[PDB]
Each structure stands twice: as structure tokens, then as C-alpha cells.
Structure 1
Amino acid sequence: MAQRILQLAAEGSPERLQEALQGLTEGELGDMVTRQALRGRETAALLKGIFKGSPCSQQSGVLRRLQVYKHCVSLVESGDLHVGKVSEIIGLLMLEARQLPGHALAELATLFVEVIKRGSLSNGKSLELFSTVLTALFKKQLINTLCSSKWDPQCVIHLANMFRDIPLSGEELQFVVEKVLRMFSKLDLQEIPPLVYQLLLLSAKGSKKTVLEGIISFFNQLDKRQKEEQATVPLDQLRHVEGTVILHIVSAINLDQDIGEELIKHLKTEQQKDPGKALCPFSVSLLLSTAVKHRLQEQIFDFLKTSITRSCKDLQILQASKFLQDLCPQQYDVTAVILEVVKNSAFGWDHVTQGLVDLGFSLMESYEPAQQACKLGASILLETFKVHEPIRSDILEQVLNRVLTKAASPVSHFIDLLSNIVVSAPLVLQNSSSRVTETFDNLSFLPIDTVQGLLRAVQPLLKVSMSVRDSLILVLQKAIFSRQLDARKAAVAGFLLLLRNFK
């Protein structure tokens, strides 16, 4: 039909095109589906061809315009075209689309996915034109019966990635959610990554509550099930799902993570049943791996503190009872939660689980029951030294100079902690002792009792290698010739009153 539009409306204004196609009659849509593999830029050639009839979205093209529409929105809406022509037809369409007739443009276009998407979908390209006609302007009643009312595989990406430009979150957020469960959940590894990312970005309008509560709610239902029935594994794919939903919450955490704090410690820690809400593994894993940043020390430290406090000082005050301790509730142990998280985070949540080593070095000392609190903090620091093997060498160096240069209170907590750490250190420095060989000289000003315990604790490591001892002997001997206070003695005897004294 190459001569057709360009001979009717090719040369002539008032009666050329109207005459040479008053009844060209291929349906409404002869050439563009009479020459599917048409002549290069024929797509817009013929597009302005029909456009010689009347404008875009115009009522006068009851068969001409709207039938160019019916042809393109469906056949090249789902079938095969040129992907580039799959840009071009929609280009020229979107362009003409501004000039529609105020009724004549209302196609099956308020829920008219029920016209096309509900039974005919699978190619995303076509979705944008709905955004175009919509922006042209309610009609979303089909949206009520289907936010994805048959979105089997294609009510997740395609509907969202245009729900950006022309979406409504009142039931569109919720409908995404309800779909997430076993429909949306059908994708394995696509269940929370892609839809989650789109979900948050579309959240950028709002829905702090309803778009917050669900990512973790779904996460925690999945967890409670796949635990009480017995990237990680076929039963560790909780690793991938966690990695996404966290890293997404963390990265976008800028402006509305004040709301995540506000809710996930204003709901659970208000009605108090948070031991089953404000402590689930995948619902605080965020709380303390999206907090190693700068605006997070001041709220996260205080939250976890008051939690450990109220939790322990309740769930003991009914551990001496029967007339109120046996015909009575259950308790979920906040200490057991945090000790769980130390167990679960062995999978790889790196910047989700360096908040721990920081939690240890900055609770298990400075925390001050109160003695129970410090006793707890021993657990976080020690266990974190226990499980995840690459990230503790800096833990030990935080400790040594946290507790080998201070006032007299630093004997007990940190001294016992260094004792237990090095003592649990199965040669943890047993080839890594280079912070020490310049720690050791600092000691000639410590108190009376501290110099002993420093000697004793390091006394495990002294058994290893003469690079420890051949430098100890010197950095002490020098003390004896000069002032040489009890420290030279505590040391002379300690080396002597030891097997190191032999040979």
C-alpha cells in the first residue's frame, strides 16, 4: 500500500486523501498489517498516512484511528514485530495521543486490561501506552477485581514498572502484597528482589506503614514456617530473600528509615507482644545491619539496650513462682533472639553483621541485670568471635588497646573478656602477633593489679614463639637497671615461675 496514503494524501490538501481512501477498506488497518515487514520507515509513513484522515485519539477515526489502535495494541501488543518498530509504532502513537476526542479516546481503558491484559499479555512494551492514555486524563474498577486478577507470571514486573507512572497505592500496594504470597511467591529468587525493588521505589510516593510492615511480615511468616517444620540453600534460600529485602531497605534507608524505627519500635514495644514482633530474626536483622551508618548509633544503641533490659528484668521476675508461673503465659527470650541472630548471620550478611562486633566492643564493656548486662555483652562479642571466621582479627585489636591503656575500672570486664577471648583463641594470634610486640612496652605505668593479669592472660600466647618472648625479656630488662618498679619483679618471677623458665 506504499502508493496508497502517499498518493491519496501524497499530493493534495482538500480532497486527495479523503477521496483516495474514503473506503480503502482493509478493515480499518490495511497496509501496516498488509505489509507487516513494511518499507523501513513505512511504520510512520503509513502512520501519518492514516493520520491524513484525522488526529490521534480522534473520534472521527471510528474505524481508522481506533482501528490502527486495535491492531497495534494487540497484534504488535503481544505477537512478533520489530522491537524497534515496537518502539516506533508506540512512539508515533504516543505523540498523536495528545489530541484525542474526549470520549473517542476512551478505549477499553479504565480496566481494559480486562479488554487486553486479563486474557492477552506477556509483552511489556504495550503497557506504557496505558500510561499515555491515562495521563491523557475513576475508571480503575477492573483494578479492584484485578490489581493482577490473572497476573500469573506478568502481574509482577510489567504491571508495576508502569504502575510507577500511572499507579494508585491505596489498593495497589495492598494488591501487590496479597499477590506476593503464592502467586508473586511463585518466582524463586524473584519473589522479593525485583518486586521488592519496584515495590520500594513505587513506595517513594508513600505507604511507609503498609509498604514497610509487609516486607518483614511475609519474611517472618516464611521463616516461622520453614523453621517450625524443622543466597543459602534449598532450605537456605532464606539467604537470598534476606539479602535482597535487607540490602534494598538499607540502600533506600535515607529519608523514611525514621519511619521504620518509628513503627518497628512503636508497635511491638508498645503493646509489648514484640517478643513475637519486635524480635523476629528477619525483622531486626535490618534493625542492626542498617545501623552501622552514621545516623544510627544514637537510635539503634538505645533500642537494643532498653530491649535487653526490659526483656531480662521481666522474664526472670516470673521464674520464681508457681501460683503465677505455671498457670501462666510463655516467654520468648530476647537474649535467645540476639543469640539466634548470631547463629543465622553466618550466611554472609556482611554489613548486616559487623553491627555485631561493634555491638560487642561497645556494649560488653561500657554497659556498666547491670552485671547481667555486661555478662550478656560477653556473649555477643565472644560468640561473634566464635562463628564467622574472617571478621574478628580487628575485634581482638579493638580489645587489646581498649583495655591496656585506661583507668582502674578496666580490670574486671575487659580483663575477663581478654582472658576469655585469647583463651578461646585457638592460636588466634598463634601466627598473628604484631599488635602485641608494641603493646607490651606500654605497660610500665599500669596499676598494681593490672600488670599481673596482663602477664597471666598473655601467658597462653607466650608458649608459642620466641618472637613473643625474646622481645618481652628486653622490654622488661631495661626497666630493672633503672627505676624498675614491682612490674620488673612481677615479670621476672612470671617468666621464671613458668615452664618458659626451663630452657
Structure 2
Amino acid sequence: FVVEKVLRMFQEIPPLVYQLLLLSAKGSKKTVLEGIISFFNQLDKRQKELDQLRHVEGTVILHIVSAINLDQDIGEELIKHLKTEQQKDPGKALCPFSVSLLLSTAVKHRLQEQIFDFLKTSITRSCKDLQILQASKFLQDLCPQQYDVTAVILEVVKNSAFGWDHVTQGLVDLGFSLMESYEMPAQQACKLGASILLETFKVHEPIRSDILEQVLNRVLTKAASPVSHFIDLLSNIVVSAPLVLQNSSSRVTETFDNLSFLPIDTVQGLLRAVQPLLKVSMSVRDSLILVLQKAIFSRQLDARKAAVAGFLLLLRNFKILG
């Protein structure tokens, strides 16, 4: 009755809900978690028709993630509650505040694999349900409502552009992990990861270098399978910001050192993407010319074909007019 009444009894919000978090660590965590999540849900819905509200949201989720890190037992009950909500409603209880809170907790390895698995299965189920509903009008007549989860996952990008720290970290982690998860709904998931990475690069100005380093390292990790979509993402991210590549240089040469290992026509895309880096800088041009000289004199055809194919792009890139 106490928690119900004080939940009914809604600046001073973060200390107050911190006190309730301690009391519910003594008492029942699920009820207060549901109450606060719902309350912020109608707050956001009212806002749908703000800066202080976003600051309050960031502060309170910071207190919640700090408390959950202090006491990790609450997380299992929270995930059980969310599983029950997902069972009870067709993708309901997944709002921008809730997913922001979930992403904030997915940085300290507190069962982050479980978080990613839950999000992935929910996303695939939502996409499959929408796909089935779109096919027939008889379904559309009876079941008009639809809970598209991609809409909220895109909206939390804009919601998290006001300075939240853990939220963007978890968001980038999910966006990267979706690429490995995808390895058709899988194409939808891959496009969904590419869109999230493009949006969070376009938004998070201070975090450009970390994203560039992460995608560059992932691109040249191992040529086990086709990674052409990674190269498309590389082109899309680098074409937006030209000077960004210059700051994070001297890693391009390391990738160039072993380009002629598993070329599947991705070398043309990579060279076309990083051509702006090559034209402005002469050191990269010298290193690439050295690699091409190594390739052309090679005695094996497999490396030779990629070498001459890249060599053609090198020749056509630079104008010889004067």
C-alpha cells in the first residue's frame, strides 16, 4: 500500500526515486519499476503532442543503472518482468525510456549477452508479424494495430542525442552486434544496424573517432566470409565527413599491408571509399604504390588479379591534366 500510494503521489524526482529504489531493494522492486516506467511512458506520450525533462530522464536512469550495478540481483527480476510483459502484449512495454534503460545496463557485462538475445528475438518477431500482417487484408480488417519496434529503436537515437553517456555506448554495442547476428529478416536486421550506425555517427559529434576505429578494425579483422556490407557502411560513413579520415590515419596502411589475401571484389569498393584519404595525403599514396609494386611482381595469379584491378582504379583516380 505504501509503494502504491507514493506511486500515486506524483527537480526532487531523482532523490525521491533513489529513496524508493533503496526501499524497494528492501521491498518489491517489480512494482516500483513498472510504475516509474509507465509514468515516464505517459510523460513521453504527453510530450508527443523537454530539455529539462530529458535531463531528468538522464539523471534518473543514471541513478538506476548505478544502483543495479551496486545490486545485480534486481536485474534478473527486471528481465523476468519484461519477459512477462512481452508474453502478455504484442511487443508492448517497449517504449523509448524502457529501451534506453535497457541499453544503459548493457555496458558492464551484467548479462549483456542475454540483453542482446532478448532484443534480437523481439525484433525478429515484430518484423515477422508485420510481414505476415501486410500480406492479407482479412488480417488487416480485424487486427489494425501494429507495434513496429524499429520505430522506437530509431526514436531512441534522437532521444539519446542530448548528452547521455551509457545509453549511446549500449546503443553502439547493439548496433555492432546486430551485424554479427545477421551473418528475409536477416537483411532487415543488417539494414537496421547500418541505419543505427549511420545515425549515431551523424549525431554523436565527440564520438566520431571511436566509431571510425571500431569499424576500421572490424573491416580488416579476418576475411572469413563476404563483408561487402561493411565496405558499404565504410563508404557511407566516410563520404559524410571528409576530414574525419585524416585524423584517424596510419591504420589504413596496416589494412593495406594485407589487402591481397581474400579479395572478393571488395578491394575496389574499399579503394573507392578511401580515395579521398589517398588524394590529399602523399604518405598513403607512397605506401599504396609500394603494395602495388609488391603485387605486380608477385608470381601467383590470385594476388595479381586484385593487384592489377586496384591498379586500374589508382590510374583512373588521379587526373593527369596540366
Equivalences, count: 317
Deviation per CA, 1:185-235: give whole Å up to 9, x if none. Answer: xxxxx33211112111222312112222222222222111122xxxxxxx2
Q: 1:428 aligns with which of 236, 244, 257?
A: 244
Once the 2 structures are TM-superposed, how far is the Cα of residue 290 of structure 1 from its aligned partner?
Answer: 1.1
Offset, 1:446: 2.5
Given the alignment of the two structures, is residue 485 of structure 1 paired with residue 301 of structure 2, yes or no? yes
Change beyond 3 A, Cα 1:196–1:395: same
The CA distance in 2 between the partners of 1:183 and 1:405, in whole Å, is 54
Structure with more contact order per residue of length (Cα contacts < 8 Å, sep ≥ 6): 2
Q: Deviations over 1:39-77 (max 9, x none)?
A: xxxxxxxxxxxxxxxxxxxxxxxxxxxxxxxxxxxxxxx
Distance in structure 2 (CA, Å) of the matches to 1:465 and 1:300: 43
Q: CA deviation at 1:338?
A: 0.6
* Contact 2:175 2:197 (C-alpha < 8 Å) held by counterparts: yes
CA offsets 1:231-258 (integer angstroms, 9 cap, x no match): xxxx221222212221111111147655
**Residue 442 of structure 1, CA deviation:** 2.1
Question: Structure 1 residues 183 and 211 mapped into 2: Cα distance closer, same or farther (>3 Å)?
Answer: closer
Equivalent position of 1:349 in the other structure:
164
- Relative to structure 1, the CA distance from residue 410 to residue 448 in structure 2 (aligned partners, 3 Å threshold; closer, same or farther) is closer
Secondary structure, in 3 states, of the residue corresponding to 2:129? Answer: coil
Once the two structures are TM-superposed, the CA of residue 479 in structure 1 deviates from its matched residue by: 3.5
CA change 1:496–1:248 in 2 (3 A) is same
Do 1:286 and 1:352's aligned partners in 2 also have CA atoms closer than 8 Å?
yes
Distance change (3 Å), C-alpha of 1:476 and 1:457 = same
Unaligned runs of 5+ in 2: none
Render the CA deviation track for 1:119-160: whole Å, top value 9, x for unaligned.
xxxxxxxxxxxxxxxxxxxxxxxxxxxxxxxxxxxxxxxxxx
Q: Relative to 1, partners in 2 of residues 1:257 and 1:213: Cα closer, same or farther, differing over 3 Å?
A: farther
Once residues 389 and 280 of structure 1 are traced to their aligned partners in structure 2, the CA distance between those partners, rounded to angstroms, is 25
CA contact (8 A) 1:246 1:286 kept: yes
Partner residue in 2 for 1:176: 2
- In structure 1, runs of 5+ residues without a counterpart are 1-174, 185-189, 228-234
- Assess if the C-alpha contact under 8 Å between 1:360 and 1:380 holds in 2: yes
Cα shift at 1:370: 1.8
Q: Structure 1: how far apart are the matches of 2:297 and 2:278? A: 24
Contact 1:477 1:488 in 2 (8 A): no
Do 1:360 and 1:381's aligned partners in 2 also have CA atoms closer than 8 Å? Answer: yes
Q: Does the 8 Å contact 1:430/1:461 carry over to 2? A: yes
TM-fit CA distance, 1:263: 4.1
> Deviation string for 1:473-495 (max 9, x for gaps)?
12332343454755456445545
Deviations 1:339-359 (A, max 9, x none): 111111001111121111111
Offset at 1:323?
2.2
- Contact 1:361–1:398 (8 Å) recurs in 2: no
Cα 1:419–1:366 shift into 2, 3 Å: farther
Q: Label 1:247 to 1:179 Cα distance change in 2 as closer, same or farther (>3 A).
A: same
TM-score normalized with structure 2 length: 0.85
Tell whether the 8 Å contact from 1:180 to 1:191 is kept in structure 2 after alignment: no
- Shift in CA distance, 493/291, structure 1 to aligned 2, threshold 3 Å: closer
Question: Are the structure 2 counterparts of residues 274 and 345 from structure 1 closer, same or farther at C-alpha, using a change threshold of 3 Å?
Answer: farther
Structure 1 residues 96-125: Cα deviation after superposition (integer angstroms, max 9, x where no partner)? xxxxxxxxxxxxxxxxxxxxxxxxxxxxxx
Whether the 8 Å contact between 2:257 and 2:291 is mirrored in structure 1 is: yes
The alignment-based identity, stated in percent, is: 100
Post-superposition offset of 1:440:
1.4
Indicate if the aligned counterparts of 1:268 and 1:274 stay in contact, CA closer than 8 A: no
Query: What is the distance in 1 between the residues matched to 2:283 and 2:123?
Result: 43
Contact 2:278 2:284 in 1 (8 A): yes
Of 285-294 and 428-437, deviating more is: 428-437
Range moving further from structure 2, 274-283 or 241-250:
274-283
* Distance of 2:275 and 2:265 partners within structure 1: 16
8 Å contact kept, 1:455–1:491: no
Rate the CA distance shift 1:263–1:277 in 2: closer, same or farther, 3 A.
Answer: farther
Mapping of residues 62-461 of structure 1, within 5 Å:
184=10, 190-227=11-48, 235-254=50-69, 257-263=72-78, 266-267=81-82, 270=85, 272=87, 274=89, 277-368=92-183, 369-461=185-277
> Which has the higher Rg, Structure 1 or Structure 2?
1
Change (3 A) 1:210 1:328: closer
Q: Distance in 2 between matches of 1:494 and 1:214?
A: 60
* Range with greater deviation from structure 2 (480-489 or 312-321): 480-489
Query: Whose helix proportion is higher, 1 or 2?
Result: 2
Distance 1:491 1:176, change over 3 A: farther
* Displacement after TM superposition at 1:322 (Å): 2.0
Q: Tell me by how many angstroms 1:401 deviates.
A: 2.5
8 A contact 1:278–1:284 mirrored in 2: no
CA distance, structure 1, for counterparts of residue 306 and residue 15 of structure 2 = 64
Contact 2:92–2:147 (CA under 8 A) maintained in structure 1: no
Which region of structure 1 is more displaced relative to structure 2, 397-406 or 346-355?
397-406
- Per the TM alignment, residue 313 of structure 1 is displaced from its structure 2 partner at its CA by 0.6
For residue 419 of structure 1, report the CA deviation from its aligned partner: 3.1
Q: Aligned-pair distance for 1:276? A: 6.8
- Deviation of 1:433 after TM superposition, in Å, equals 1.7
CA distance 1:501–1:332, shift in 2 (3 Å): closer
Alpha-carbon distance change, 455 to 199 in structure 1, aligned in 2, over 3 angstroms: same
Q: Displacement of 1:413 after TM fit? A: 3.2
User: How far did residue 434 of structure 1 move?
Assistant: 2.3
Please list the CA deviations of residues 354-382 of structure 1 after superposition, one character each: whole Å capped at 9, or x if unmatched. Answer: 11111122212342312222222222222
The answer on whether the counterparts of 1:268 and 1:277 sit within 8 Å (CA) in structure 2 is no
C-alpha distance after superposition, 1:442-491 (max 9, x if no partner): 22323353433333332343333323212211233234345475545644
